[PDB]
């Protein structure tokens with residue numbers, strides 16, 4: 001069995017910014033989710049080999065995880081907040097696509113996503 005390469009977290013020719021919204025996404029949104037008791041399955045790419053999920057990357061073609069997001073934020077990979085918001089949403093959606101309602105991992109994603117939504121509700125106006 002084989003995992004795909006992870007999502008990129010470095011691309012020197014991609015234009016980059018550090019906006020106040022991006023800073024909030026790191027200091028508030030990412031930090032809040034990362035410390036949560038349910039963060040651990042989301043803190044790195046899905047290891048389909050170790051988890052014995054050989055169909056995961058047959059079904060999930062746009063993988064995303066908070067490890068990747070954390071690196072992207074810390075390494076100023078993004079141009080805007082929407083890019084990062086999309087990554088979080090891709091992570092949650094993938095979980096729901098792959099798994100079944102009421103599965104433990106879905107309950108975990110839902111708890112994290114509730115917090116995500118509460119924090120992005122107060123994304124600051126771009127300064």
Ligand SMILES: Cc1nnc2n1-c1ccc(Cl)cc1C(c1ccccc1)=NC2
Nearest residue numbers: 040041042046047051095098099104105
């Ligand atoms: C994210 C994600 N999306 N689907 C899966 N995951 C996981 C990723 C990493 C780990 Cl260690 C477990 C799971 C688990 C998992 C299952 C029950 C409780 C905790 C994690 N399920 C497969």
